[PDB]
């Protein structure tokens, strides 16, 4: 109903905590995710303050109304949350115990630059604005951060969940304000990746390269072109889930080379073709024995070239 | 309105149970699925005792207001569930019967390593805290849970609903609380995917492999790389359903063994074709003789050694 | 506020109705569909009896509070129904007149062995609790129960929405209960199925046909494995609609009878070709002119067969 | 509170009139458009009315609660109208006006006979109920209808919007009711089919039409059924977005069309190969020389028939 | 609860200002995207005037209940916004100091005449009503605007954020109402459109263009119709992101004059094998080198004109 006075000037300290429960619906195009945990709050009020012999009783219990409650709220969330208020605690000196559970979605920017191996870091602001008759800061309570043991994400391995101790402060529409951090470390599982996608391109690939062992034309037309429609759609299976950034990443350099040696390609058809039309098979051949070594040598530098590019 | 108090240290005990109505809405992907069903409670509160000789009457009836009703709450939800209060019901001796109906969205993981033979369970947790005066506990009503008969899964066979009786307690925030455990067993429907994936895959297969009595090349190119586009275009259509794993699955490692035949066909039609053009025409014939033979029998045997891997 | 006492020990007979104003949104694969409608319930209650000529009035208006009305729901439905009171109406005598406007989404199965020539069945079930001190049971007013003329659902004719007069009553959660059943017959139109699907496929088999015509070897090979790939698109086309059942459809059927036939043609003309090569031109010419003949019989003998044995 | 009790016995009239100012989302499968507009109301009261001297006032201001406002409901909605209150004003002899904001989701048939170049009409109905002492009939302001000119449908060009002055009076459920009709004109924007869907149509048409120049069986088969295959990629593109109807369309019309030209070009080719291998080149040529004439000609008039049988 | 009385006829100024927190989803089709902002306003109110002095405090805090607040409301919005108070001042003299944080859904129009590099200006409206006592009229506080250095959208840069300080006055339902206009100017990121599109086709436009140092007909028949298979792919990709638009756009020009290329090189093509057919090698030879240097050359020079016209 009124914010607790100061003795003098002290502003009024909060301490919060999260305790994850849920965690789920992490999409890249849309660089969301929903959460379900627990909230916590803590501060000091002596207007409240009782004598526990007296009134026989050790904790008294408040409804949510006919009490001062500080107003947290998130700063990249979508909506409000929807949170409902478990129990509320009053300790004989003033300490005033608040918990409750909600769900929310949090829009948190993702980097692809390692799309297949890439680690994210997710980020959840805590912000409290300054009322006209106190100074409000808030504070990390670290025995009440953590996670349970059954949250999972698809797709993803959970490293850590920890917060930043240090709140930043500053001045926002002639109020001050207490921002804190909380962050959230993943990792993606790659492994679904190279069975369904890197081999088989590697076959495909491969099936391709087989053109400079025959000396018919239609043949190796036929082949070639047959291996980039293939390519062509699987390159739009892939797009259909990577969203696009304004960075060049690992994958679409890969296809991207991929294009690049199958235009070198028919062009070696083409003049194999073109000087074996013009009575002159020595060159053709010799064509042929150095591109059947070339091809694969330089595919494979240009892998290892890009590999310590994004990664080193 | 306040917790009933203990006769000297004794929790108080409430028991539950779950009788299914509706259950819909299975996402492989999302790992989520929809119920509606019933919520039974029944604890003791000497305070409602009365005399029904002096009040005329056997059972009372109150509203939800002005009434004490413990909190339950589901574990595994994405949000609060929408329930709304059907009866309330106090026997003289002071018992209290209380009945909702409530709808909710719930969130399990399933395991897809026989995916399309597989049984899935899943979990539906309920969980209460308690109060700074009364410790409560759990308890399971054997004769309130149960299914009606016309419960249906689109795509799946129900087996059975049971409950574990003994709960789980534990220390949370500061706070002992009570698990209890609901489980719904399913089995999937396969019929659907042998005509509609596994017979046409067997017949493409067997398109290709007519290319070992015929000795023109561009057919045979032609064959084998019009048959590996419509694999891909299959494998697509799978893939659009089946969601990523972080370990190996039984379709997927039969279509990277399809990918690894279609290679190999391949390199033997190249073969022959590369030792017929240097006017060794007996060698050729041997290798299509040994290859017609060599294809089923190693494809029978790998698939058989997959499938005790599997389900052994 | 309290259910009218019996006179001795009759139950209280509730009168319902429903008419029909919107239907909409009819998914096959979720098995659900939308409706708006109206619902109308009537009773007696002798409490509210009152002397026309005294009171100098006819019909008196009462709003939802300060007054009975029983509680009825629906059985398969996602959530509660968004319902509003229109108007309540007493007669003298104590007759109580109830009506108002809802909105549901309905949850009911479906049949799809005649999935392009089918007719379906739409149930819609309402259901009322009996309290401690009375015996509530549901009746039909035949009076108030149609639809609109305007009422249209986008592919299905709608033929007659009629209810069983017969209740059925049982004992749930220690309690009787009375169910009735709505029951909603509509018609698919199969009109536009014809020219979008039967007769393209009609035609590219008989352009795959026609390599029995034909003594070239890759020309028969590329015209019968392009129409396989034409084929395979359609069948993803159709595919992308039809969810899956665990039985044998008329279409499942068609497909697979459709593969087994390119299957077979590629093996004749493996054959004429083989039989070519051995320097053995009378066997493969009398094979083709079999086959010439052969194929459209039996096509049309399977169909024929396939149509009695799904429709007899 | 109470609705106005008549003089003797005339009907109580309201005057309505919506103004648009949102129209979007305008769906061709589920044909349901969204909306948001301002609703106007007007009517007589007598026992409102005031002395403007002895007051000091013009006019009075009520909130929505102490005064009765008649219950206008829609017809074609999927679920009620999200509404609030804007203003409520009373002229000293008792007219009071009454004006809101809603959003509301209408479901309005269309006609897709003519679906490249068609014209659709949206209807709004409104309706009222008689309560048992007064007769309520609706009524329209021209002055009050009309829509902002920054309305925009995506796709579609607006014309006019007015209404119909007569209403349509009605018994439904023992009541009488009025209901009103709104009617918005609109035409499709064809200007992005043409080169996106007509004219690569025609291209591709005409590239399968080169064969009738060649002698080559092969190159021929291939030109045809990959032209085929193009289209009918083409067909699913389109197909993807028009839903099914119970009647023949344009579109689908000319696509049957084209499969059939396409039916006849095979056999034509077929019909030349067969005349060739068996030493009768000159029946061949004279076939090929008056396909090359008659393609074009009966092409062009099939187009013309089919424009004046739907155009006309 | 009552507007405040003006002096003698000045109407009441409220300045406004909107500090953006977060804004996301963008989508091309729908032309909407979704906002998350502060909204300041303060007017002039000297019933609310007291001494600071003699009650001991400086600023006074009230409810949003027992005090007048003007309606804000928007104009291009789908719903109603989502808001809620977060302080409200008073300052001795009278000032009311106002803020909310809200979100809602926007509609705006877009234009697609550069889409690949265009620009767009995205408008938010804000509207209010005079009451039938007061002329209400807004004012732009520039002190109060301005967005956070966090605020990003995916695949756009953020300009600026300003407003006009001019309002528009105009009478609408004999009432007038002042209207501001708030604009936020954006560009699109088109890094990623180069080497996933532009390339791409380049490359397989010169795959098709190989044909002409060629003698073979089938060969060139198979790359020019894979080709142009494979271009269809990538226009279906394309087009499954742009919306339709009654006007010319750049991409659809090019995509056009690439099927009139591919047109042209079949007719080239079936040209040189009529000659060559016909025993006249010197003429195809001719057109053959021609087509080698006029093909290259009239691409070049059309998309130099292209872009000078849409981009001039
Ligand atoms: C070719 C195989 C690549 C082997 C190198 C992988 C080693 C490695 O670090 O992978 C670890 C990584 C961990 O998985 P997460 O991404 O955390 O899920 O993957 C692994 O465990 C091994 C990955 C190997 C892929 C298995 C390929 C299966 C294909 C069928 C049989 C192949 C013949
Ligand atoms: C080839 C046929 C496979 C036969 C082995 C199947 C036996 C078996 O256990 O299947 C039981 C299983 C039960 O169905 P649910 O998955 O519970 O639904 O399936 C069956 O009833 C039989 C399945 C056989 C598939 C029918 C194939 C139809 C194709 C057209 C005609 C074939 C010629
Ligand atoms: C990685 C690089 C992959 C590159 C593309 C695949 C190339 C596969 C080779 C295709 C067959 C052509 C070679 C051939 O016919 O060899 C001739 C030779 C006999 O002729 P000579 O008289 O020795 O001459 O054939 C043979 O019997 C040799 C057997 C080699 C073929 C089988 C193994 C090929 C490599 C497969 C795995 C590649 C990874
Ligand atoms: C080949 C034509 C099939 C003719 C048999 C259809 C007779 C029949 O009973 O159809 C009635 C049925 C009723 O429609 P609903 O499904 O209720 O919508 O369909 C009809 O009215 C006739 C259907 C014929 C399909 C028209 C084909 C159009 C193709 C273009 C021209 C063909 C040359
Ligand atoms: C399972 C394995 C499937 C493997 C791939 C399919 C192979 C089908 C064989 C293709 C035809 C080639 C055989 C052939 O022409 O046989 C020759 C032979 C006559 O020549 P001879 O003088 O005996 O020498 O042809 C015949 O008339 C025999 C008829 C056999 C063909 C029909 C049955 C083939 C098998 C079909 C079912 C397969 C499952
Ligand atoms: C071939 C061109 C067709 C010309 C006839 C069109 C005349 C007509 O009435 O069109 C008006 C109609 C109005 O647009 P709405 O549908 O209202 O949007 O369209 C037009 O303005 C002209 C349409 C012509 C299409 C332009 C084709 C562009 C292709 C690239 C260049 C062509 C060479
Ligand atoms: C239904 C069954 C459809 C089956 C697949 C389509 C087959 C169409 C036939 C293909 C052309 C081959 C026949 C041919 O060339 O006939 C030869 C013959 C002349 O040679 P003779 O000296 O008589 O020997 O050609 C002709 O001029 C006859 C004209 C027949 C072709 C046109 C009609 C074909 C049938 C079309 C409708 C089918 C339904
Ligand atoms: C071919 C390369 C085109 C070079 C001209 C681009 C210059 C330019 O103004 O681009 C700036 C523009 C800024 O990005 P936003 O759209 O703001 O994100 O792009 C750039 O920074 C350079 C774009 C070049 C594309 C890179 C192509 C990568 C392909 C792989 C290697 C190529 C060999
Ligand atoms: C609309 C109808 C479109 C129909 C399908 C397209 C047909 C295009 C013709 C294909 C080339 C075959 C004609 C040819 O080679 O002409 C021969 C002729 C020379 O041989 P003569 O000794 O005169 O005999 O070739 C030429 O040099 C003539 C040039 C004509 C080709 C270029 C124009 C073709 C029409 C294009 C636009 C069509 C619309
Ligand atoms: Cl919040
Ligand atoms: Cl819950
Ligand atoms: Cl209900
Ligand atoms: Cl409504
Ligand atoms: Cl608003």
New interface residues.
């Given amino acids: 109903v009124s914010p607790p006075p100061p003795i003098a000037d002290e502003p009024l300290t909060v301490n919060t905590g999260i305790?994850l429960?849920?965690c789920?619906?992490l999409d890249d195009?849309?660089?969301t995710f929903?959460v379900?945990a627990?909230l916590?709050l803590s501060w000091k009020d002596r207007r409240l303050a009782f004598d526990p012999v007296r009134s026989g009783v050790?904790?008294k219990?408040y409804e949510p109304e006919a009490i001062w409650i500080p107003?947290i709220?998130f700063?990249?969330?979508?909506?409000?949350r929807?949170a409902?208020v478990?129990?509320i605690?009053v300790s004989p000196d003033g300490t005033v115990q608040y918990?409750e559970?909600f769900?929310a979605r949090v829009?948190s920017?993702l980097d692809f630059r390692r799309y297949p191996f890439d680690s994210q870091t997710l980020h959840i602001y805590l912000i409290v604005?300054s009322?006209?008759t106190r100074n409000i800061v808030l504070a990390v309570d670290l025995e009440?951060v953590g996670k349970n043991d059954?949250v999972?994400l698809?797709?993803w391995d959970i490293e850590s969940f920890t917060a930043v101790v240090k709140p930043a402060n500053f001045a926002l529409?002639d109020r001050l304000e207490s921002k804190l951090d909380y962050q959230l470390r993943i990792s993606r599982?790659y492994?679904?990746?190279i069975?369904?996608i890197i081999?088989?391109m590697l076959?495909?690939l491969?099936?391709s390269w087989?053109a400079f062992?025959?000396?018919?034309?239609?043949?190796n037309?036929?082949?070639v072109?047959?291996?980039?429609?293939?390519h062509?759609?699987?390159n739009?299976?892939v797009?259909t889930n990577l969203?696009?950034?304004?960075?060049?990443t690992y994958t679409?350099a890969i296809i991207?080379m991929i294009?690049?040696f199958?235009?070198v390609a028919?062009?070696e058809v083409?003049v194999q073709?073109?000087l074996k039309?013009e009575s002159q098979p020595a060159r053709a051949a010799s064509i042929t024995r150095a591109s059947r070594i070339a091809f694969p040598v330089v595919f494979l530098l240009a892998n290892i070239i890009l590999a310590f590019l994004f990664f080193g």
Same sequence: chains 1, 2, 3, 4, 5.
């Fill in positions: 305790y429960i849920e789920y619906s195009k849309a660089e929903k379900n627990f916590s050790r904790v219990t107003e709220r700063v990249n969330v979508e909506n409000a929807d409902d478990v129990d605690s918990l559970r769900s829009l920017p604005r009322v006209d009440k059954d999972f698809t797709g529409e599982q492994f679904s990746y069975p369904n081999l088989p076959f495909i491969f099936i087989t062992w025959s000396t018919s034309y239609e043949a037309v036929t082949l072109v047959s291996t980039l429609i293939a062509i759609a699987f739009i299976l797009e969203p696009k950034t304004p960075y060049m679409g991207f294009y690049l199958y235009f028919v062009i083409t073709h073109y039309v």
